[PDB]
Amino acid sequence: MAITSKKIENFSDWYTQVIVKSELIEYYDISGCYILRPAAYYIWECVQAFFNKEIKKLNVENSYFPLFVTKNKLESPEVAWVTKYGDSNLPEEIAIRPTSETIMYSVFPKWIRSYRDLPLKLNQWNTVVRWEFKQPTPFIRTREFLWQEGHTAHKNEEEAVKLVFDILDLYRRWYEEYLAVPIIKGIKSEGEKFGGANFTSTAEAFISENGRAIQAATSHYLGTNFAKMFKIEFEDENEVKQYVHQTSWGCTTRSIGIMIMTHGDDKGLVLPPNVSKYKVVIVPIFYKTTDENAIHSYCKDIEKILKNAQINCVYDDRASYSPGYKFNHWELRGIPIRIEVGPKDLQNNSCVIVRRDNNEKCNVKKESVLLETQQMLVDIHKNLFLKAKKKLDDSIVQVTSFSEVMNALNKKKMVLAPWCEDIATEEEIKKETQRLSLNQTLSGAMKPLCIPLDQPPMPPNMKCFWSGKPAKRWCLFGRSY
Template identity: 55%
Template sequence: MASNDAKKTNVGAKSGGKKKEVKKETGLGLFYKKGENFGEWYSEVVVSGEMIEYYDISGCYILRPWTMSIWETMQAFFDGEIKKMKIKNCYFPLFVSPGVLQREKDHIEGFAPEVAWVTKSGESELEVPIAIRPTSETVMYPYYSKWIRGHRDLPLKLNQWCNVVRWEFSHPTPFIRSREFLWQEGHTAFATKAEADAEVLEILELYRRIYEEYLAIPVVKGKKSELEKFAGGLYTTSVEAFIPNTGRGIQGATSHCLGQNFAKMFEINFENEKGEKSMVWQNSWAYSTRTIGVMVMVHGDDKGLVLPPKVASIQVIVIPVPYKDVDTQKIIEFCKTTVATLSEAGLCVEADFRDNYSPGWKYSHWEMKGVPLRIEIGPKDLANNQVRAVRRDNSAKVDVPVNDELAERVNGMLADIQQSLFDAAKQKRDACIKVVKTWDEFVEALNQKKMILAPWCNEEEVEKDVKARTKGEMGAAKTLCSPFDQPELHPGTLCFASGKPAKKWTYWGRSY
């Protein structure tokens, strides 16, 4: 893309007695606009913002440091929280034998088209092909049956940070739908259903916090329909986000109660306190690097990325703005002192001292990368013992005195940016929610790219019928989740699609 060339150009290295040429033209503007061609805009932003690089295998992407730092921030939060819950980290192999993979019929049918297989070693065909994990239930549970014997072995609560491979799709999208991605997957076993049920919701709340407190994205917590639940599980809960520009919902993370289905298949039994043989109750739960794609889609604008301060590896970028006949060194020293002051206060701050790029080019560069706050320091700021702070989210500028309160003022601005991003995203999301009660209202709202809340009879055949009747170029509508926070369902309310008595309110829409 055009914007990449400018970043790669390092103009005017000193040679002989020639003066270094300073790059003034930014060349960093995005070619596509978010509101005009969302798909191309998104692809351009994740590359120009230095989040990913395309790889030579379709659907696989290089995650650059700018991305990995966001992932590590979320990982540190989540890993710390699950350790409080006495969940321990482990690691299981990437490879799965076909015999084990096929033991849980419903489960593997759900993943069968996506499973990648290793069939050769060098030039030799493998006698038995080996699968690459699409998820790890069938990898881990044969060993749960070995490790769990009595009630004192429970609960068994393990998590692993790993990659998985899912090969089935024709239109890969960075972060959102890739053939290999990073995630955590938790797998727990309990003596009772009550313990399993409680953990499902405890983990789901952590996922809500990742989205709302760290990524500044509003989500709905709810339960998936029988048709949309995890294959082989008892029930699935999820956090659901919404992308206003595309009118599509997106499953943010899932927490499943597997019931005793896998325990039966893999013979995960234990002797209870009465000496009786029982089967365990199991959960599995996961969130992935998809979270980062949702963040880009929700907050990004026509200048590039917009990062919430809590996940930005650089929260503040300090840029010197020298003029002719001014002591540049004094400005640079002032910048260094500012970086030190803010860093000592625990903020993530860097300065851009590259002298072969103009201040204007640097502004565009760091805006493209989504740094929450820019501090500019020029001769006037030096003279007045102040800095100019510029917000990435709304471009607001303010001159801040350099005194004992500088770090506190900057910290306050970052907190305000974090909250403002969430508030703006929630306002846009809420404006897209449409409550409907009839089929005609449903179709109209779907055509308007809304997130639809409708009364439903909770029947699978009706859900299938809605999918069939809305199938088109844009994709069919389906249930997203039935929210835990249910609006009042008045007696006599009918299902929007079947006319039968409604049993619950459910969110519907097209989705990724």
């Protein structure tokens, strides 16, 4: 099979082709739900192992809360409602969790009585259902998805904010160190922040081949807002009752999606080594051999070296298929490294190592196969990240006025604009960009993506690019998913 749509030219078709033909995703007769085949679920398992290791160092503990919330306890136009079991009607409808704030925070008071019960730090690896009737995009925007949601309660605001930003850096490492994707850290505007949050912090990603931003992960400071709604109070060290200061943070399998859209090429899936089940595929070339079993033994001992070094590989000894067919088979599926061994290189005690990301063929003696493999795996990651980073940073153009924006938006860029952050302007900007875009399947609108944590200098009397009023801060704007 082959990718018959160029990514730069027909992005959404390239994407569906890649995710189905690499065996990541299978479509399902309920739209917005997709089957995660082994190759994608493996990526999820990897980032889950990493994130678990890292949040246990923050003393977060894993737990599992129910899938169902009662109607009253959810007081939304996006929720699947259960009503019957078999043919009998439920006494009252129950909702499938779209998020678990109201499921968890209504039992938090049974656990929190005094300052000696804090901080409470829980995490869930679960599934949520968000039944939006807009159009789905696999991984990026789906009605059922896997995620992790963490929730903490602290005795004050300093501890809670510190954790919000510790989690945000763990999300940075999740994307950069495992998915080789660079992200922009920022604060969400108050029109786009989480409902009930004090502030929402965020990591944003950008798909430059189609000009779209994607929110990669979120860490919210809820403050005492949910504490006052659910009366989560505690006796402090002065016998005074106080409200807990709360955080919640989440990340979903959308991350896999962002990864595919960043590194994928026209040959197919390109996988960062850390998240590929097979890091190496060994492909024999049997033509012109003198001892087929010698080629077998040679490949199998390369295999033994690698997995004795904890490097998982597959030996593709299928006899019917040409070497070229197998090269394409494993390239499509994103295996980062291929080892070719033909009769000349058994004669030389060498083998050819091929990097998936640049297709550079390299002749290495077998004596240093492992070392070279390990080095290349590391370098593959570096290069995937670096290529992505420059692509990200060449996608942001600073503008001082709205008149420069549409042009920048039509070259598939993000605008860094000085903004007064007044909430009424978010919708005005969205509709104006929406109407101007209506002149050549997803939305033309431009929205605040985030106020970046790393700020350029604000010149003295800088006017807001939309309002003409004093500009509060620099904000990223762009089309998104």
